[PDB]
PDB file of C-alpha atoms in Angstrom:
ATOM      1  CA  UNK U   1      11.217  12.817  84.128  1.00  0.00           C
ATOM      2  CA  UNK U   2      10.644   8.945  84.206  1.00  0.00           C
ATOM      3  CA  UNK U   3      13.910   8.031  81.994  1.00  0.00           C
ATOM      4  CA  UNK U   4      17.040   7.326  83.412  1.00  0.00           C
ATOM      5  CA  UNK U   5      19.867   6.415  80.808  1.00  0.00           C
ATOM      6  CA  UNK U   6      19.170   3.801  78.390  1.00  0.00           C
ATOM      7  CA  UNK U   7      22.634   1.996  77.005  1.00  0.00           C
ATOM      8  CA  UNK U   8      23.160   1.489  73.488  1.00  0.00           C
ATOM      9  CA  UNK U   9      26.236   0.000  71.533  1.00  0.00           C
ATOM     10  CA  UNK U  10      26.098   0.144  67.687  1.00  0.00           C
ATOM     11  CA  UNK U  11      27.083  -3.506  66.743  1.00  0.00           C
ATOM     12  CA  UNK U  12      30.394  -3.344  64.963  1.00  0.00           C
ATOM     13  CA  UNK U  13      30.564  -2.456  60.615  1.00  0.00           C
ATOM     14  CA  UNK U  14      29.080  -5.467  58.978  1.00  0.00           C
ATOM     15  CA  UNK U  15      31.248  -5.103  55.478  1.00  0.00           C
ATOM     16  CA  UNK U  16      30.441  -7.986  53.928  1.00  0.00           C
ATOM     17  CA  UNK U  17      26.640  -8.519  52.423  1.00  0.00           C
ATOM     18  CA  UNK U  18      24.892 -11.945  53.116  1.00  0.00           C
ATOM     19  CA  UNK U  19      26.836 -13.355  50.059  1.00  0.00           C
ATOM     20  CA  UNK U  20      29.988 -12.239  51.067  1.00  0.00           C
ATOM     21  CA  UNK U  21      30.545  -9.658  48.596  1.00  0.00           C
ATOM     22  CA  UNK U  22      32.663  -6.573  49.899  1.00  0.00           C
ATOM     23  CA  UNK U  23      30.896  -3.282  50.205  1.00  0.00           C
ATOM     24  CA  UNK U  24      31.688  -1.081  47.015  1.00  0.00           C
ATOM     25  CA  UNK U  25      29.582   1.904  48.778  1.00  0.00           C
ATOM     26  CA  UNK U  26      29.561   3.717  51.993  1.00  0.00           C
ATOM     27  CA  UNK U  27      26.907   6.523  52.433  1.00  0.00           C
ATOM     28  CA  UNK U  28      26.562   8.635  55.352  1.00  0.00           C
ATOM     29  CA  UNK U  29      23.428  11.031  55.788  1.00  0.00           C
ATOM     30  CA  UNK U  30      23.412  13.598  59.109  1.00  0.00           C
ATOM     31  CA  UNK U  31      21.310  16.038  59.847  1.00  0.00           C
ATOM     32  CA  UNK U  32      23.456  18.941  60.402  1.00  0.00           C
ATOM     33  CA  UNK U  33      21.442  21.542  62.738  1.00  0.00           C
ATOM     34  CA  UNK U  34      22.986  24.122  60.491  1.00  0.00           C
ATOM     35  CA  UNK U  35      25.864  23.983  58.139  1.00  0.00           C
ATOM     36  CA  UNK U  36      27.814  26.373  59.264  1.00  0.00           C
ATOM     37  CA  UNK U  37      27.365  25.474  63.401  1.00  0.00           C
ATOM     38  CA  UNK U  38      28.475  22.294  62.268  1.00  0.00           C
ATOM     39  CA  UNK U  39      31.473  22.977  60.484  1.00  0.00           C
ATOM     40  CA  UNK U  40      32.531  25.302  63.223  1.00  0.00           C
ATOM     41  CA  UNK U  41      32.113  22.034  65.572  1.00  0.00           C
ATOM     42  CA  UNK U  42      34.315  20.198  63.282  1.00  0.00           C
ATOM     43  CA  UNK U  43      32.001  17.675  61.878  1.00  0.00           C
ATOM     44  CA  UNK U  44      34.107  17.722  58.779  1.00  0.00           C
ATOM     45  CA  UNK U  45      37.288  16.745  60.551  1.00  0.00           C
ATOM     46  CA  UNK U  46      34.139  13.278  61.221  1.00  0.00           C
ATOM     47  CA  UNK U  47      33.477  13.769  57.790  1.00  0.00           C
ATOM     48  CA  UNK U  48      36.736  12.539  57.164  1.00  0.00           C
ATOM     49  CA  UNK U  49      37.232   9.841  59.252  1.00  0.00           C
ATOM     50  CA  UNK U  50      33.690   8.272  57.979  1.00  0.00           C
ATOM     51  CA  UNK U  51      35.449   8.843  54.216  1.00  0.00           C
ATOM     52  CA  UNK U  52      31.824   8.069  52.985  1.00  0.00           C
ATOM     53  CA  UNK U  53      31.656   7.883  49.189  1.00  0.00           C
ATOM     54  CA  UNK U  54      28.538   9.706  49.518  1.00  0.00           C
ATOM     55  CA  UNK U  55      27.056  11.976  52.279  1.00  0.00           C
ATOM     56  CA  UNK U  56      24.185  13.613  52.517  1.00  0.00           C
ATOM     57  CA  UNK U  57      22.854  16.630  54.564  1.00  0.00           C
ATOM     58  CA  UNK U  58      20.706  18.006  55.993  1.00  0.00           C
ATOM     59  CA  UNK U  59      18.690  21.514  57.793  1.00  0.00           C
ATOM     60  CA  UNK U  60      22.145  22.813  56.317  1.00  0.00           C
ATOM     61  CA  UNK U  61      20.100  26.224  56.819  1.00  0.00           C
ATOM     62  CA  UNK U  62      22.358  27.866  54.044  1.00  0.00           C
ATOM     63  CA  UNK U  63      21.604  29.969  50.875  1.00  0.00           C
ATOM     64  CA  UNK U  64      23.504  28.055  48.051  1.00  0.00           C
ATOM     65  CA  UNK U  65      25.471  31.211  47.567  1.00  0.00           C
ATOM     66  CA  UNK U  66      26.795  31.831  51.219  1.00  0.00           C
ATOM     67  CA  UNK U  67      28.193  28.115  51.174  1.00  0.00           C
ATOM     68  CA  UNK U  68      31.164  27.546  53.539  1.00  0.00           C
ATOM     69  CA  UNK U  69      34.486  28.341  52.398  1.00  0.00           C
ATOM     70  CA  UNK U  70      35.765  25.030  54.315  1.00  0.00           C
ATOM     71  CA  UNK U  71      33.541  22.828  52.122  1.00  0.00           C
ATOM     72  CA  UNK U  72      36.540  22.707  49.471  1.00  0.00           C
ATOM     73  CA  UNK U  73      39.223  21.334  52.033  1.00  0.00           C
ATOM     74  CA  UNK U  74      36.971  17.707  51.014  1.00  0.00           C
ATOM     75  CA  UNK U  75      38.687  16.716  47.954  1.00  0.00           C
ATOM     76  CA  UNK U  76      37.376  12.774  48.409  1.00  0.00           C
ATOM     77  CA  UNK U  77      34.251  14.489  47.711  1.00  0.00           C
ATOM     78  CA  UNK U  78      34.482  17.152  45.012  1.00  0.00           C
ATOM     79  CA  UNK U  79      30.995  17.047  43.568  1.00  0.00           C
ATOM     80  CA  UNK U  80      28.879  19.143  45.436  1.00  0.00           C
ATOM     81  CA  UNK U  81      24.953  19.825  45.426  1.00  0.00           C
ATOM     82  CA  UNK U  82      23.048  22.186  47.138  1.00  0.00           C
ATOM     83  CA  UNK U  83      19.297  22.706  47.538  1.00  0.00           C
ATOM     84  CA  UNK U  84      17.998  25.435  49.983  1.00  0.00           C
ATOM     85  CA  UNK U  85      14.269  27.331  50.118  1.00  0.00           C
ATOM     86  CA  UNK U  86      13.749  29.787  46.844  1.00  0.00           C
ATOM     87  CA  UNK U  87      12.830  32.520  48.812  1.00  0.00           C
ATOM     88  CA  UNK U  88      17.153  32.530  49.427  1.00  0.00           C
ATOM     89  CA  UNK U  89      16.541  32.226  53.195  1.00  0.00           C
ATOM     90  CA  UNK U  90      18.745  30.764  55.506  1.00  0.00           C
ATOM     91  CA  UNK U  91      16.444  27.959  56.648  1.00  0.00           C
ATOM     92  CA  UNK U  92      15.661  23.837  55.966  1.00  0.00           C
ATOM     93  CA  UNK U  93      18.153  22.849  52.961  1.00  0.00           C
ATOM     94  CA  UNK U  94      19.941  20.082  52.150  1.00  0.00           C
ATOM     95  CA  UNK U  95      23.036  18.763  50.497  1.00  0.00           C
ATOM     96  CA  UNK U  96      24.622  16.231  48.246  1.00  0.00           C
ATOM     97  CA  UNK U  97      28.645  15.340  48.221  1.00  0.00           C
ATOM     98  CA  UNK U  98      30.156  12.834  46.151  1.00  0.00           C
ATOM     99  CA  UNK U  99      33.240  10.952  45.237  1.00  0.00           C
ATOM    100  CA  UNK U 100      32.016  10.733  41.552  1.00  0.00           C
ATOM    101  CA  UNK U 101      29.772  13.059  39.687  1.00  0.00           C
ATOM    102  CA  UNK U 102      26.123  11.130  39.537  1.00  0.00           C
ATOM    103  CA  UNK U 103      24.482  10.574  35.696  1.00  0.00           C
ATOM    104  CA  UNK U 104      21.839  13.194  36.314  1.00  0.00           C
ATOM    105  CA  UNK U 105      21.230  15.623  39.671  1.00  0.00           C
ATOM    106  CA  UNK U 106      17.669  17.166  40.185  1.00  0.00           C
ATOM    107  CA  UNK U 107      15.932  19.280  42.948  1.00  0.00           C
ATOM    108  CA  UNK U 108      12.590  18.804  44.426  1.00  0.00           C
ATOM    109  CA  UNK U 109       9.886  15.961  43.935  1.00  0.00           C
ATOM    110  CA  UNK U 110       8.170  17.864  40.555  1.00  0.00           C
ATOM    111  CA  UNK U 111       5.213  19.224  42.205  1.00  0.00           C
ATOM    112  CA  UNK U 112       5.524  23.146  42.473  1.00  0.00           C
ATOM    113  CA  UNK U 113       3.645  23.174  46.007  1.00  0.00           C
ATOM    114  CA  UNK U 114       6.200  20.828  48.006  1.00  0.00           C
ATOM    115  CA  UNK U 115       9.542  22.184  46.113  1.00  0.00           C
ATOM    116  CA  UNK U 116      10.019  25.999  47.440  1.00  0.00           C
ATOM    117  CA  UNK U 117      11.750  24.777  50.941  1.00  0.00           C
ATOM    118  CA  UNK U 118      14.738  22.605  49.423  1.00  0.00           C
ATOM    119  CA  UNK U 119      14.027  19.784  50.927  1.00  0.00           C
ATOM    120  CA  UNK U 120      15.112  17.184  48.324  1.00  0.00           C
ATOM    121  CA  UNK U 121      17.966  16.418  45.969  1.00  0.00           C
ATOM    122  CA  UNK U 122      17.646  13.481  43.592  1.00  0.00           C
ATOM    123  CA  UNK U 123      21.277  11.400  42.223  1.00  0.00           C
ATOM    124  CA  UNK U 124      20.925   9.301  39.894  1.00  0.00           C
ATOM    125  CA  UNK U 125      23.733   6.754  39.326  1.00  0.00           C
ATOM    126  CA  UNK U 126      23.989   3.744  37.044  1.00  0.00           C
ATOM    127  CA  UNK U 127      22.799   0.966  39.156  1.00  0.00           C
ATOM    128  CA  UNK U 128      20.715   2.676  41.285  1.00  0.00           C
ATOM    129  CA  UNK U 129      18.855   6.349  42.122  1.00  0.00           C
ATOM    130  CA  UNK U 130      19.794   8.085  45.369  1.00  0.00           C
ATOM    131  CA  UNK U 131      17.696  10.453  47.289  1.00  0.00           C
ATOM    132  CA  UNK U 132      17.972  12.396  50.469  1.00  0.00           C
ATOM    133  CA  UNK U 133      15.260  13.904  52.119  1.00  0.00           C
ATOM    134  CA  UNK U 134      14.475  16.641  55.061  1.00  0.00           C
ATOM    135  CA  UNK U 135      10.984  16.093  55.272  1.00  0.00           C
ATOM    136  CA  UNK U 136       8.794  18.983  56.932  1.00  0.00           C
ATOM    137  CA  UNK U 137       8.003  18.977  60.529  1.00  0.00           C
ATOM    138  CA  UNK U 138       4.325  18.692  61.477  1.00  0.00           C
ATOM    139  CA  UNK U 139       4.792  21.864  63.999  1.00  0.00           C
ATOM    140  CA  UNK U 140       4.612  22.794  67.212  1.00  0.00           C
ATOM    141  CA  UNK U 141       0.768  22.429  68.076  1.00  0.00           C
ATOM    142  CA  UNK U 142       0.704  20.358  65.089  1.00  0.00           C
ATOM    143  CA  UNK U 143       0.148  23.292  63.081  1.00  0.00           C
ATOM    144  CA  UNK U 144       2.164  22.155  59.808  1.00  0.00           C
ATOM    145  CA  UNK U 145       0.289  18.061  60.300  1.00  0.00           C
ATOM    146  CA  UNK U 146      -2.165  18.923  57.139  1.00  0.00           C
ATOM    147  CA  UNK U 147       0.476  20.373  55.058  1.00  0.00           C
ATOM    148  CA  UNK U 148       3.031  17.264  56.142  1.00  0.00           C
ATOM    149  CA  UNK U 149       0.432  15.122  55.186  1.00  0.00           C
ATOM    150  CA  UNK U 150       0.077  16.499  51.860  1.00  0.00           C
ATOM    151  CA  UNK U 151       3.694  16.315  51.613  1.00  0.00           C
ATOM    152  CA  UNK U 152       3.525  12.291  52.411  1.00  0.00           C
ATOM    153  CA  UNK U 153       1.215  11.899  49.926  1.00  0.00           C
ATOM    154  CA  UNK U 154       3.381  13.530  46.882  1.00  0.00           C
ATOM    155  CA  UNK U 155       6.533  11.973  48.114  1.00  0.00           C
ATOM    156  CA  UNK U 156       5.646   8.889  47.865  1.00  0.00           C
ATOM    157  CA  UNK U 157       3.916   9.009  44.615  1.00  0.00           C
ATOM    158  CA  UNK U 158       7.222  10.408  43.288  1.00  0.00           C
ATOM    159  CA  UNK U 159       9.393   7.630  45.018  1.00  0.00           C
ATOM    160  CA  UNK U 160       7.221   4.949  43.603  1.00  0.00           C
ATOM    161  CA  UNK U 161       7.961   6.525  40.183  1.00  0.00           C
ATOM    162  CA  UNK U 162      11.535   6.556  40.614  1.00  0.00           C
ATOM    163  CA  UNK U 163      11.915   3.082  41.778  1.00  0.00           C
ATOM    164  CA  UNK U 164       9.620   1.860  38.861  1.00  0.00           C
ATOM    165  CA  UNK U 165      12.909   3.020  36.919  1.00  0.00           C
ATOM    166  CA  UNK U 166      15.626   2.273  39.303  1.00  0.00           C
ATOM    167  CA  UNK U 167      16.057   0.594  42.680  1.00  0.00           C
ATOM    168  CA  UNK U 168      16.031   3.393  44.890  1.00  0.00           C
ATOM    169  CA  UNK U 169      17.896   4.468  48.313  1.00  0.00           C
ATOM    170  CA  UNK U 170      16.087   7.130  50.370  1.00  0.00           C
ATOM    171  CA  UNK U 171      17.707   8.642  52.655  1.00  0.00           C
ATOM    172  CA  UNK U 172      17.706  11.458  55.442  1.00  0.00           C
ATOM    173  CA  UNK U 173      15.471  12.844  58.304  1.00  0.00           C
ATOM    174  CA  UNK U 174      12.203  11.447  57.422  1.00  0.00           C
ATOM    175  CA  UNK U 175      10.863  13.721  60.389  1.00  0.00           C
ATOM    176  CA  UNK U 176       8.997  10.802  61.756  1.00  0.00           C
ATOM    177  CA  UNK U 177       9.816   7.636  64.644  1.00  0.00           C
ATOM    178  CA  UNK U 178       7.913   4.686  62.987  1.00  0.00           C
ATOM    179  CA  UNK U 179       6.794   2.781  65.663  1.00  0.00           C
ATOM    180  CA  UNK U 180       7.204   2.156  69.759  1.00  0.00           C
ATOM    181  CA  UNK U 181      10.474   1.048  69.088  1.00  0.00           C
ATOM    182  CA  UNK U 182      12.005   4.101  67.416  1.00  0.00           C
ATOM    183  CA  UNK U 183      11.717   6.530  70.553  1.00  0.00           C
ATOM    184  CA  UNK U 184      12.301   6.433  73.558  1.00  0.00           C
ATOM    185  CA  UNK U 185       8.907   7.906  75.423  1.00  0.00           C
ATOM    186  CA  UNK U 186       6.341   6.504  72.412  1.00  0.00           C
ATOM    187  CA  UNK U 187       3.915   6.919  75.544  1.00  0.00           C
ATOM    188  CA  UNK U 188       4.054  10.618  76.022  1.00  0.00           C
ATOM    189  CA  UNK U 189       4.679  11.882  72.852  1.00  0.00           C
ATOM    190  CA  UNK U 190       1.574  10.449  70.148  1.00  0.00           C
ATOM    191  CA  UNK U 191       0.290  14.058  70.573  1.00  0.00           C
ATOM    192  CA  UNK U 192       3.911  15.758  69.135  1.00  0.00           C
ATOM    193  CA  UNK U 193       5.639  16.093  66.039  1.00  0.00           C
ATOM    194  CA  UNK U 194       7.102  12.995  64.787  1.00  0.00           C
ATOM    195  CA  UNK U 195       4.805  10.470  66.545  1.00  0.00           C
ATOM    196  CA  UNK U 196       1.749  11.389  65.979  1.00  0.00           C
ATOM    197  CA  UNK U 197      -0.734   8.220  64.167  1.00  0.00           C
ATOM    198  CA  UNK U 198      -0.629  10.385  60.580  1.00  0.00           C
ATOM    199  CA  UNK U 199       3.049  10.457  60.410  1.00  0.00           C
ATOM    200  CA  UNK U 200       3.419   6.937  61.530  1.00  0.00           C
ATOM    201  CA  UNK U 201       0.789   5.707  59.160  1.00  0.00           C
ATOM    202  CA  UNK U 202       2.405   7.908  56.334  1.00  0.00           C
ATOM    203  CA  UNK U 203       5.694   6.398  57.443  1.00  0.00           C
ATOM    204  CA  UNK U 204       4.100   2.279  56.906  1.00  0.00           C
ATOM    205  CA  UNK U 205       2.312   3.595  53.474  1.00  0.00           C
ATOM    206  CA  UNK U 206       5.925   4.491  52.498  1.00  0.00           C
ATOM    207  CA  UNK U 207       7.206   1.138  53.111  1.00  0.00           C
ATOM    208  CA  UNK U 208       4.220  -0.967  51.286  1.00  0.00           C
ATOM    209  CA  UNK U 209       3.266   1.681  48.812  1.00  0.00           C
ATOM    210  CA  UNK U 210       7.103   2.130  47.329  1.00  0.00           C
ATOM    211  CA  UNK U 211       7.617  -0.291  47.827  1.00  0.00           C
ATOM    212  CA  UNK U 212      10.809  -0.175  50.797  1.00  0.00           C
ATOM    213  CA  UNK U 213      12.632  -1.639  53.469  1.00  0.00           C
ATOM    214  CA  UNK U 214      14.069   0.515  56.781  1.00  0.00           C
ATOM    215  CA  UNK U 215      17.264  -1.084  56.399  1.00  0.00           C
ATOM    216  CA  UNK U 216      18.486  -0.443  60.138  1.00  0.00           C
ATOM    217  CA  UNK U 217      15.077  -2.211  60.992  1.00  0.00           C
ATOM    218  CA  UNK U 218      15.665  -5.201  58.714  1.00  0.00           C
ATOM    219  CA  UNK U 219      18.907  -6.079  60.039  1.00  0.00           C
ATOM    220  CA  UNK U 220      17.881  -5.099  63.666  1.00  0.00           C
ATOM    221  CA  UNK U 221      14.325  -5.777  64.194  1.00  0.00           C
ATOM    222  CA  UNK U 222      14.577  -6.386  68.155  1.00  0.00           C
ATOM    223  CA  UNK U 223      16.943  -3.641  68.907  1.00  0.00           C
ATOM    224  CA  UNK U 224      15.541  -0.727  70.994  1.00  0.00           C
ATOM    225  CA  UNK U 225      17.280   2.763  72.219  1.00  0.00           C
ATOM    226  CA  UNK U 226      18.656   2.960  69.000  1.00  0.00           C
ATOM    227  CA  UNK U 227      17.743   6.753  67.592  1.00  0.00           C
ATOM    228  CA  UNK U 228      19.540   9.538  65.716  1.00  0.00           C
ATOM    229  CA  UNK U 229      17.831  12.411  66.944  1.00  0.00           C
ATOM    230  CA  UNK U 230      17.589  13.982  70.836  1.00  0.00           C
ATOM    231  CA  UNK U 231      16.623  17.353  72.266  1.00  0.00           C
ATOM    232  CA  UNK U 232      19.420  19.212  72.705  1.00  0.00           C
ATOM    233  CA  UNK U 233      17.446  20.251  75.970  1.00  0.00           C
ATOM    234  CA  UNK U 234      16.820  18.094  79.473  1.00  0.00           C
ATOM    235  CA  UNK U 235      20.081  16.494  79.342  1.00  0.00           C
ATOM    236  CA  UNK U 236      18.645  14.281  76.886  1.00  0.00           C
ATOM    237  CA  UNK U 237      21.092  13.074  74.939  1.00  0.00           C
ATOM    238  CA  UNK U 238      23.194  11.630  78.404  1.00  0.00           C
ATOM    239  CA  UNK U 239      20.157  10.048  79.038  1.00  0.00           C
ATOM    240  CA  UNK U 240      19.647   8.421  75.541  1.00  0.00           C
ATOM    241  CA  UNK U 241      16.155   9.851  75.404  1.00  0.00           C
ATOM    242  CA  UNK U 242      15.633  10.370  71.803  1.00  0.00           C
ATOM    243  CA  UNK U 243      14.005   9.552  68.883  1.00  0.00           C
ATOM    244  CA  UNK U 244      14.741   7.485  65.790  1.00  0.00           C
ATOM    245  CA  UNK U 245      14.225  10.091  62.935  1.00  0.00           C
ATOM    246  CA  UNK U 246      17.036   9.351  60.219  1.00  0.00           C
ATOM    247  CA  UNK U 247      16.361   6.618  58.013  1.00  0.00           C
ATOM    248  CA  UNK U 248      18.065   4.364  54.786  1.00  0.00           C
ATOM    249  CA  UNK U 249      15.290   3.298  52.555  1.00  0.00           C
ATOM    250  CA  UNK U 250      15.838   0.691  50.074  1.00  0.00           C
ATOM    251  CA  UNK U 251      14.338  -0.969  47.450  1.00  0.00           C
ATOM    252  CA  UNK U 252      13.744  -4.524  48.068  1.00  0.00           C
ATOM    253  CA  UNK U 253      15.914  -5.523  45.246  1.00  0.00           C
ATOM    254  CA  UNK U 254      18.488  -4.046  46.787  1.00  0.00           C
ATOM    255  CA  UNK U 255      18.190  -6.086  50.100  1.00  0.00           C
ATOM    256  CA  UNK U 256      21.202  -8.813  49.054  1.00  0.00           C
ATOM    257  CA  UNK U 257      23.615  -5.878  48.795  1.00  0.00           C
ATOM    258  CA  UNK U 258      22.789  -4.362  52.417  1.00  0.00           C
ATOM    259  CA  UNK U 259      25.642  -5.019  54.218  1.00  0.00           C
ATOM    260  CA  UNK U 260      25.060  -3.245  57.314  1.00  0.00           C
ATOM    261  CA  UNK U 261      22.985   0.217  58.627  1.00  0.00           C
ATOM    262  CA  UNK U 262      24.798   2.031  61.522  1.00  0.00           C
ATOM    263  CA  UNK U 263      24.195   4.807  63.540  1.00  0.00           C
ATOM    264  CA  UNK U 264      26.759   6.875  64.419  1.00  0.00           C
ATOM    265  CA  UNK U 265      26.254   7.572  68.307  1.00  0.00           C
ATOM    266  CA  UNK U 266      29.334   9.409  69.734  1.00  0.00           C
ATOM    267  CA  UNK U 267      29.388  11.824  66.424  1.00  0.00           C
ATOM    268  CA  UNK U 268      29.187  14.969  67.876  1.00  0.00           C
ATOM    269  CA  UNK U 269      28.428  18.508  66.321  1.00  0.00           C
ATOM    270  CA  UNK U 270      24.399  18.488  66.015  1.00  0.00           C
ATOM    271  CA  UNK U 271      21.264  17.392  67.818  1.00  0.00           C
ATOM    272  CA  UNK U 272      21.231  14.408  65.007  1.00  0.00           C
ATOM    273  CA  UNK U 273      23.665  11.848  65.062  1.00  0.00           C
ATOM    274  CA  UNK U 274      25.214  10.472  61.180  1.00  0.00           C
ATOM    275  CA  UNK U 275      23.719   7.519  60.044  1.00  0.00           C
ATOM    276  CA  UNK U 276      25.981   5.138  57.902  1.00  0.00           C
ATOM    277  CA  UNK U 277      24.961   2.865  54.739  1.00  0.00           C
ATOM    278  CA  UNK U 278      27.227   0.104  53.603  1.00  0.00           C
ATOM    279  CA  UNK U 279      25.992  -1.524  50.059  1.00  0.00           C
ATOM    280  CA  UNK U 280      27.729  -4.287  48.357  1.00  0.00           C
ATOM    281  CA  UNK U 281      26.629  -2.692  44.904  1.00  0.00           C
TER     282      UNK U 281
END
């Protein structure tokens, strides 16, 4: 192809907020390629190393009753939530682990139509609502673009109506690279899921409409060949040809408590790399 390899160094843990408050929360969200895959390629074992107080997951691809035995050697994070399609197949999902049990847990966005895939799981916590997403894929051929777009719309209506409560942290694979900057061939790729205009546009009325902040993007506005996502095909990932696709979202009140927004790039055990939140909250 035309990309050679493309270095990027995640700048060091920034653990201290502009005010110099500590950071009294670390989240991690991953995309998992498959719960089980995972474990078996010990992304647990990174798990705990991270020692997140919160991590999220995602495409766990797992009926919540066939969870993983091994998901009860994590005693740092004992309260455990699970949302995966109603139809009880082994496909999309995602998951919810925490060091303490949140006020209130709830599945879905409240709109029967977008809520059969279990793609979202809502925490809420006393200073602030957590969500992590795994938002649908337009298709191959672009087949699913109409429904995502439908999907976009709802979302962010129900966002905007949790934030109007709480300040609000989105997280997860938001199935989209924003701008130029997020992947690596922006060029080639306007035509494919994850780039095309619709997504990008849905992707900026997220931002205003909300209204939120792309935390890595805040803190690193310049910064290119920094992505969380690459095909697990063409050598890709050597090559640092990938895709920005896993995002924190946050509130703007919530901006003088960001303390940093990593990306985990040498975290093996999926197509996605972990992405890493630190709060001063």
């Amino acid at each position: 192809a035309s990309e050679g390899p493309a270095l990027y160094e995640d700048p060091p843990d920034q653990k201290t907020s502009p005010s110099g408050k500590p950071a009294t929360l670390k989240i991690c969200s991953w995309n998992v390629d498959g719960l089980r895959a995972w474990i078996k390629k010990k992304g647990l074992d990174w798990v705990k190393e991270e020692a997140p107080d919160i991590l999220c997951l995602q495409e766990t691809k797992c009926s919540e009753n066939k969870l993983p035995a091994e998901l009860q050697e994590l005693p740092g994070l004992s309260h455990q939530y699970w949302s995966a399609p109603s139809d009880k197949e082994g496909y999309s999902g995602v998951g919810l682990l925490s060091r303490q049990a949140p006020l209130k847990v709830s599945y879905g966005i409240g709109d029967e139509e977008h809520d059969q895939e279990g793609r979202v799981i809502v925490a809420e916590f006393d200073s602030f609502v957590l969500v992590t997403a795994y938002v649908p894929n337009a298709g191959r051929g672009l087949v699913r673009l109409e429904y995502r777009q439908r999907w976009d719309e709802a979302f962010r209506k129900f966002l905007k109506g949790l934030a109007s409560r709480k300040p609000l942290v989105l997280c997860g694979d938001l199935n989209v690279a924003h701008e130029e900057i997020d992947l690596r061939n922006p060029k080639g790729n306007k035509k494919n899921a994850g780039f095309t205009p619709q997504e990008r546009q849905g992707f900026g009325e997220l931002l205003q409409a909300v209204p939120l902040a792309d935390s890595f993007r805040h803190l690193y506005p310049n910064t290119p060949y920094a992505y969380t996502f690459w095909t697990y095909m063409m050598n890709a990932r050597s090559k640092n040809v990938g895709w920005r696709l896993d995002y924190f979202l946050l509130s703007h009140s919530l901006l003088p408590a960001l303390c940093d927004s990593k990306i985990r790039s040498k975290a093996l055990g999926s197509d996605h790399c972990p992405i890493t939140l630190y709060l001063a909250l």
